[PDB]
Design a protein around this ligand. Structure first.
Ligand SMILES: [Br-]
Ligand SMILES: [Cl-]
Ligand SMILES: [Cl-]
Ligand SMILES: [Cl-]
Ligand SMILES: [Cl-]
Ligand SMILES: [Mg+2]
Ligand SMILES: [Mg+2]
Ligand SMILES: [Mg+2]
Lengths: 690, 679
């Protein structure tokens, strides 16, 4: 099924301690802590590095040589074991960075999987349950279930036979020398993972593949497992979390009501364990952190999408914002154009804090903004902010070169819910909590009848657990069928991002492009151009919102006919984006239908600039004329712009005609076509007067 | 685009007061109490009936004609205060209707004469505001009901002609407003007997909301078999459903089928019954439990679960009185004792002034006969009336089922081990929480102060439960077999997604018993005696798979003679069984090998196959080995005495439809083979 370096892999057998979990470093720490308590002197780092691989008897004799014959080693070792379980049971088993990402890839590739550990069945199961990785494994082979343990191949041969597989059909993951010998001898595809101590030359010669850590194997495995397809609407997010944090600089409409979905989907195998989002909206921050989750409402399908693992912070709080730019692997900048200059300072501090931190991986920075050269604006202000802060030209330029700054194109209209509407929701939801809290003390009491399975010692202990759980969880049972709605968004999925960052290569809701130019030109002419031309027609007819205007057959007919003429043109110019034009065309018409909230004024701002020769309106006309396509609705659209400028913005008609003739001259058209286009357009402008 | 009795429908506009919710009754009572403690003289019942589906401004005009702002204000305050305590009284079938129209791709709206502030407050509380694109209140409208402006404006804002829109209404005045708009009117009876003038205007009439739903449903496409990780519906209906036995099948299969339902709505609550108090208190404490599909490492959360005690009468009566569907998931051993609880439930259902779909989940040739026999004897004993019993029996739909899915119930030891580990995480989480919404962000200091109080005590109650985002209560290990096969009859089962209707259920149940459950038990006995604790691992052994394939061959050869019409499909069913067994690693042999003696009965999955093969002179060598291994397991693993196993062996062979020559030969061959296993 899964092909790994030209070898068919049907199985994956993992060692537990030192391979899956970082429990060798914990045993390293607990031995030092246990020594400090009892004998007073702390067992040297160097001694413990020497004990890696050696038996408990050999380790004791070494301790006796260094720290005297009467050193209570068995006492220190027994204490260290108590501290290990004590720590693991409350704080959780330390999982190697990359394991869950690897397991999901192997599992979704249809591999049967086992654990081959020298630990006891009882303790091995608790650890795999504690870590929440037991779900990935079909069978477990343990040291107390074999005649001869590692480095004898029995444990790996048995694990393989239990999965209905020959050893040579299985990947075998291992850290220790004895384990690798066991795995190699069994005949499996051995994968040696360095834990603490550098592996000797014999181990590196023996192993089929060697990696410095789990994440290096994940990078290699990613070459043999596919990037998943574009997520559909109402498609679940992954169940399994990785150890990565991601950031949304600006928890606004687009940040909370789109980017959160892309990050929640991630690569389809895992998703980030924490999504940090910044906002000065205190009501939004406290509300989300109170619920521990918010939801995005998709009106068209009446679907409420639960975005979990969210942590909302204050944009003004320095310690929280630096924590985002220090711990995040990917950050999405989702601010308006007129907030870039001010926010560039707190970004510069964030990237400087990351540079000073001992954070080690380059940051992927997505620029989310509906402007041409949006990246340029952010980078220009970020450059100044870094110089102003550090006063170090070498460090400033290092930061700008180190990280991946990605230009993007987004095609999803989103509406952030008002504070009045949120308060209304928080009031009605709080009511249900009181209605829920008034009939949970009606139940009352906790009882466990004669089980005739559990011992009376642990039967009493079971009652205490369920009692404690019931008290804490029961009040939050209402969250099952209760969503904190903060966003109303359309169903447009794909985000176009500049290719470069390795971290984007597996993101399934992302569409990678070598240069953003092409899709940004489409966004300009097909989306923003039509949106402006439609908004000019909406305003003159005297409709409050562009959504209300679609009720008029004239407006809706114009919109459908206008996208058609622009598409026909762009299909010849960019035939490699044929599927993207057809998708975006329909995505625009769907969103325009009930676009009530967002006004026409914002969309219709600066009509003269938008009617430039190389801009969204006039460029489309010139393309259609050159290739002899219908441009009658584009001509009508161009006229509405000059008409809007005169009536609403109070611009003189002389200024409109002066501007027009200059643009027509610049267009790459025949002398005949120029005069024809001028004569037709001026007649439409003088009609809309009356 | 939807075709409702020929006419093409593009949209659907609903009235709120009396049509969607039963608020017309509430304001009927508040207006009377509002005119008692202010003016003294209460309103006449003529005035209130004339003020059905009227705006606050319109109702004021009629009041001055006969004889209001101050009166109606206090009436509204009384009304919404009742809603904040007892919730919005939603008309049964509303959420079911709305979702079907929404997924049909129709542009839906609301046309209510109530204020916007009032209209939204209820729509939000009912959680039905998400189903509507635009709403038209009795504020922005210049001339309200019975003038068609409010309905024309609602239709216009959807960007469709009024004649393309369905228009729901309860009131006489509102029905005129709907009719005069020139749309497809629908009338729902609430608190006024429809007049001649009303019934003539209306295109369709229904006694209640749920009657329309049934009529609409024949034009709504029935959704097909759900995929493995396909989500459940988001919107809940008002229907309850029950699971008589929270076991491996009930909790680990039926709960998924009921949670999927029709694909439009999901039952309000699922009531499951069990004596396992650990399982009961675990689910109720967490609020949810998850089914683990090990093959794809997928945890399927099942919510709206209420686990009750089987012994508790009132809780089992609550189940049988208010449930649209009950799933009987008990073994034969308990059928007799549990027939008493079923009798009381069905008798309590009749005494309470929609029929029941009763699913019998049992791996037995003729399972319904056993249940219906014990149920009749149970009812007759309590009721002491033959007239009431024969009605009950022939009223409700008692359906035979075939369950192919292999599911395992988690042991109490492993459930305690889970709770112990997960509790330590909760304790540490309650230390991390450790210990004020400032800045007027477009809100008044009064509201901002009130908001702080709401969020503070919301965090206080919710913050401890945040850990449940990651933490799941795993109670079942299941394979990815979706479709359940059920007997035809019940109209409800026609629309359920995971249900596949068949005619000849008996012939399928027989093959299921012999070829599936019989081989499953016999290879489990063989695997158990060899030291394997899991079916999945056991099938890795060449001898265990070879034995299973040999048994399959001997059973199929027999079934081919008994059912030649099913002989073509046997190879698919036998292969489908081996596929399920091959990688059933979390499915233990002990679960499959339960009740050896019961499964070695003369008319059961083992002895029946042997008898058929003997009669037709077919090879039954491996079948005889599996029978011997069945008694070998009983004596060794269960410890039931050797003498009792022989008394069972002799009694069953005596019952077998064979000649005395064949009976004595079979007994001689089998008892000899039992001794050979030990010695
Ligand atoms: Br990771
Ligand atoms: Cl061109
Ligand atoms: Cl309902
Ligand atoms: Cl335990
Ligand atoms: Cl086993
Ligand atoms: Mg190891
Ligand atoms: Mg851009
Ligand atoms: Mg009404």
């Amino acid at each position: 099924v899964l092909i790994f370096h030209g070898k068919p892999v049907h199985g994956a057998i993992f060692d537990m301690d030192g391979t899956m979990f970082d429990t060798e470093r914990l045993r390293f720490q607990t031995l030092q802590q246990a020594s400090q308590e009892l004998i007073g002197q702390e067992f040297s780092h160097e001694y413990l590095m020497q004990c890696l691989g050696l038996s408990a008897t050999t380790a004791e004799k070494l301790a006796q040589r260094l720290y005297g014959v009467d050193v209570p080693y068995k006492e220190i070792r027994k204490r260290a074991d108590e501290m290990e379980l004590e720590h693991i049971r409350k704080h959780g088993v330390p999982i190697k960075k990359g394991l869950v990402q690897v397991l999901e890839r192997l599992r979704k590739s249809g591999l049967r999987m086992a654990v081959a550990t020298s630990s006891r069945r009882a303790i091995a199961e608790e650890y795999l349950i504690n870590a929440n990785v037991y779900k990935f494994f079909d069978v477990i082979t343990c040291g107390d279930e074999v005649e001869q343990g590692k480095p004898h191949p029995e444990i790996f041969l048995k694990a393989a036979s239990q999965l209905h597989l020959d050893a040579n059909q299985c990947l075998m993951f291992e850290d220790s020398e004895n384990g690798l010998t066991s795995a190699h001898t069994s005949k499996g595809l051995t994968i040696l993972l360095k834990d603490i101590k550098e592996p000797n030359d014999e181990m590196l010669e023996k192993a089929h593949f060697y990696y410095d850590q789990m994440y290096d194997f994940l990078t290699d495995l990613d070459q043999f497992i596919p990037v998943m397809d574009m997520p559909e609407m109402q498609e679940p997010f992954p169940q399994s979390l990785n150890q990565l944090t991601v950031g949304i600089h600006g928890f606004g409409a687009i940040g909370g009501g789109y980017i959160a979905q892309i990050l929640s989907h991630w690569d389809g195998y895992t998703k980030p364990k924490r999504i940090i989002a910044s906002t000065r909206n205190s009501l939004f921050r406290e509300a989300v952190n109170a619920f521990g989750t918010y939801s995005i409402r998709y009106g068209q399908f009446s679907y409420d999408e639960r975005i979990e693992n969210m942590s909302i912070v204050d944009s003004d709080n320095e310690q929280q914002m630096l924590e985002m730019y220090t711990h995040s692997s990917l950050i999405a900048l989702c601010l308006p154009e007129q907030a870039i200059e001010s926010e560039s300072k707190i970004i510069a501090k964030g990237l400087y804090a990351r540079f000073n931190s001992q954070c080690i991986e380059p940051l992927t920075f997505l620029i989310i903004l509906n402007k041409v050269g949006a990246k340029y604006l952010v980078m220009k202000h970020l450059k100044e902010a870094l110089l102003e802060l550090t006063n170090d030209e070498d460090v400033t330029e290092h930061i700008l070169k180190e990280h991946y700054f990605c230009d993007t194109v987004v095609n999803r209209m989103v509406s952030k819910l008002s504070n009045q509407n949120l308060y209304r929701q928080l009031r009605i939801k709080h009511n249900f909590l009181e209605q829920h809290l008034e009939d949970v003390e009606q139940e009352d009491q906790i009882e466990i009848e004669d089980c005739n399975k559990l011992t009376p010692d642990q039967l009493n202990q079971a009652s205490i657990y369920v009692d404690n759980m019931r008290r804490n969880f029961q009040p939050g049972h209402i969250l099952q069928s209760m969503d904190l709605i903060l966003f109303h968004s359309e169903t447009d999925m794909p985000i176009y991002v500049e290719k470069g960052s390795p971290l984007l290569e597996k993101l399934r809701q992302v569409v990678l492009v070598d240069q953003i130019t092409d899709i940004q030109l489409i966004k300009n002419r097909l989306w923003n151009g039509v949106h402006a031309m439609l908004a000019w027609y909406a305003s003159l007819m005297g409709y409050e919102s562009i959504g209300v205007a679609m009720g008029d057959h004239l407006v809706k007919a114009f919109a459908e006919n206008l996208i058609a003429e622009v598409k026909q043109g762009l299909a010849i110019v960019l035939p490699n984006y044929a599927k993207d034009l057809d998708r975006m065309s329909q995505s625009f018409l769907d969103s325009c239908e009930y676009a009530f909230k967002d006004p026409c004024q914002r969309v219709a701002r600066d009509p003269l600039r938008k009617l430039n020769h190389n801009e969204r309106v006039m460029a489309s006309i010139a393309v259609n004329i050159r290739h002899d396509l219908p441009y009658k609705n584009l001509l009508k659209g161009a006229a509405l712009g000059y008409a809007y400028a005169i009536q609403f913005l109070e611009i003189e008609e002389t200024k409109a005609v002066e501007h027009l003739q200059q643009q027509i001259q610049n267009l790459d058209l025949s002398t005949a076509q120029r005069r024809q286009l001028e004569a037709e357009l001026v007649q439409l402008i003088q009609y809309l007067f009356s």
